Design a protein around this ligand. Structure first.
Ligand code: SF4
Ligand code: SF4
Ligand code: SF4
Ligand code: SF4
Ligand code: FES
Ligand code: MG
Ligand code: MG
Ligand code: MG
Length: 581
């Protein structure tokens, strides 16, 4: 048990904890920069969390345990002068030009610069930014004129994915962050999940922009531009318009998209119901064929890359149903012309995703048919927010509108896709009706929901028991495989999401500062919007989507065979054996 003095205030406590956490718990202000996800930059501490421990001197509060007898001052002249000096030294390596910067409104560094009134000793004005910028990836971009070498991306990659695809590198004697051997991230084991972006306090890591693709299509006279947003966008984008957390902004988005000039307003949740139609049918086919088991979901492109890069032997076990993005895009170039008269070559299909890996998915060479891409552009939640703001659209004051129904209606099963276990729950609702030839009333699968990293359940389908697992985060996929859990029982159907919490925590999502992350459970609060939609929607099974039923009846035929299997499916194949590697 210990007695601590902080700024003249005595505390008696038996906690073993850092100075930073104790102070934050007790409403004592201490700044921090490189501390995130319970780690700081061990090899280059930022020291923004400096406090004074009398008799010891200046210490980093984020990684120093409280001890009995400690006398701590967090706000003395020596403390503030040290912190201001560290910020000044960061300004010496930082192109401090906030005007055009993509983190201008929510940058953690600018906040600290303002708080400590810090100024560079010599302004950093690189004349040739070409050498600092890497835009080679289909998903990520790096601007090292902004990089603080705080290490948050390196730490976040290891924690979220355990790939360590984000590394410190020695480039010509100086330290940078980047991919293995300074390669393009796409050419490495990187998942392109963008958790590194989410962890970055500044504009050093970003998504690969598709905004010019979209603007050029909107302005082209002959192009008919469809837009469709992912489940998670409607639960998240309001954060960037000062509306707070957990706000359902679906109807405002539809209105904003119309004001941006898009020609048709659809919804990827329609694609989610499509994916369930194909994937639940496939699961039932596998049950009747007594294999092959397990089936894995195939809708998360971060997981697909993880399987390609680390578990190629599982590729044959992935469901062949395209992801909602790609299945929707395929239908947008085939079914949609059939009900509209549009020339398929003039359709330009844009999605809004919470995800950077979806850009790589959309750009895969074979994601096209008859020369027409399934998906022509993917913009992140952050990109859509900037597009709205650039157009001076008053998002928070917009009236609600509706999607165009033909590829815009969605069931409550599609609505929950963006949360971990959502795909599993949605798929079970259709699979059990399909296999039992029934219209079952009990449709809620709460046992697969929530933030546990590995969630297993036994389910009864047509009077048999099957084992399902929901793998929640790429690091948890490694744990499930490396620990042998995949062999502890026979699994039949496994959902994998690369981002812990599901797509609501994807790499294209609004940044959240560390203090808000402590006060708000962002993964739960964003997901709550989706579960709330499902609870109150009339149709809660994908196969009850009336517009989807019409599309299958009039165009595709039966799911899982014939034309539907021919055009709505995509199989990944391992590389053939060769030597060397
Ligand atoms: S990263 Fe932050 S401090 Fe740096 S230029 Fe952008 S907004 Fe300004
Ligand atoms: S995209 Fe994901 S896997 Fe790649 S470096 Fe970033 S965090 Fe790591
Ligand atoms: S890219 Fe961002 S998170 Fe990574 S070290 Fe640089 S500033 Fe920190
Ligand atoms: S969990 Fe969602 S946001 Fe994250 S990589 Fe997968 S598809 Fe993208
Ligand atoms: S926040 Fe403590 S060393 Fe960076
Ligand atoms: Mg440390
Ligand atoms: Mg136009
Ligand atoms: Mg198949």
């Amino acid at each position: 048990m210990k007695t601590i003095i902080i700024n003249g205030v005595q505390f008696n406590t038996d906690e073993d904890t850092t100075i930073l956490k104790f102070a934050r718990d007790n409403n004592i202000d201490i700044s921090a920069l490189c501390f995130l996800n319970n780690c700081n930059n061990d090899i280059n501490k930022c020291e923004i969390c400096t406090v004074e421990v009398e008799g010891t001197g200046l210490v980093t509060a984020c990684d120093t345990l409280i001890e009995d007898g400690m006398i701590i001052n967090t706000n003395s002249d020596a403390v503030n002068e040290k912190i201001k000096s560290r910020i000044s030294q960061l300004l010496d390596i930082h192109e401090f030009k906030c005007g055009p910067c993509n983190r201008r409104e929510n940058c953690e560094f600018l906040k600290l610069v303002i708080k400590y009134k810090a100024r560079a000793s010599k302004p950093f004005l690189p004349k040739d930014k070409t050498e600092y910028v890497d835009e080679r990836s289909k998903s990520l971009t790096v601007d090292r004129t902004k990089c603080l070498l705080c290490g948050r991306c390196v730490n976040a990659c290891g924690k979220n994915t355990e790939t360590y695809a984000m590394k410190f590198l020695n480039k010509n004697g100086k330290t940078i962050i980047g991919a293995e051997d300074e390669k393009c991230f796409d050419d490495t084991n990187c998942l392109l999940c963008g958790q590194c972006i989410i962890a970055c306090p500044v504009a050093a890591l970003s998504e690969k922009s598709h905004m010019d693709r979209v603007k050029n299509a909107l302005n082209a006279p002959e192009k008919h531009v469809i837009v469709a947003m992912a489940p998670s966008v409607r639960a998240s984008i309001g954060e960037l318009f000062n509306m707070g957390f957990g706000v359902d902004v679906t109807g405002k988005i539809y209105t904003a998209l119309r004001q941006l000039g898009f020609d048709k307003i659809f919804d990827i949740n329609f694609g989610a119901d499509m994916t369930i139609m194909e994937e639940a049918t496939e699961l039932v086919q596998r049950i009747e064929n007594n294999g092959p088991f397990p089936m894995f979901t195939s809708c998360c492109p971060g997981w697909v890359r993880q399987a390609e890069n680390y578990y190629p032997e599982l590729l044959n076990n992935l469901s062949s149903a395209k992801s909602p993005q790609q299945i929707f895009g395929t239908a947008s170039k085939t079914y949609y012309p059939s009900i509209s008269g549009l020339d398929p070559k003039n359709v330009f299909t844009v999605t809004v995703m919470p995800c950077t890996s979806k850009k790589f998915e959309a750009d895969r060479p074979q994601m096209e048919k008859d020369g027409l891409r399934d998906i022509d552009a993917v913009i992140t939640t952050r990109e859509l927010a900037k597009m709205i703001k650039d157009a001076k659209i008053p998002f928070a004051k917009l009236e609600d509108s509706e999607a165009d129904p033909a590829m815009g209606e969605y069931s409550g099963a599609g609505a929950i896709f963006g949360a971990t276990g959502g795909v599993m729950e949605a798929a079970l609702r259709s699979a059990k009706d399909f296999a039992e030839n029934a219209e079952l009333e009990d449709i809620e699968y709460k046992q697969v929901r929530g933030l546990n990293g590995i969630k297993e359940a036994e389910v009864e389908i047509n009077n048999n028991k099957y084992n399902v697992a929901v793998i929640n985060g790429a690091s948890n996929l490694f744990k499930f495989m490396k620990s042998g859990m995949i062999n502890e029982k026979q699994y039949h159907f496994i959902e994998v999401m690369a981002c812990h919490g599901g797509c609501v925590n994807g790499g294209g999502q609004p940044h959240v500062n560390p203090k808000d992350l402590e006060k708000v459970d962002i993964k739960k609060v964003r997901a709550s919007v989706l579960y709330n939609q499902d609870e109150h929607l009339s149709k809660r099974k994908s196969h009850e989507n009336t517009a989807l039923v019409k599309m299958y009846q009039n165009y595709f035929g039966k799911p899982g065979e014939g034309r539907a299997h021919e055009i709505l499916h995509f199989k990944y194949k391992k590389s053939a054996w060769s030597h060397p590697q």
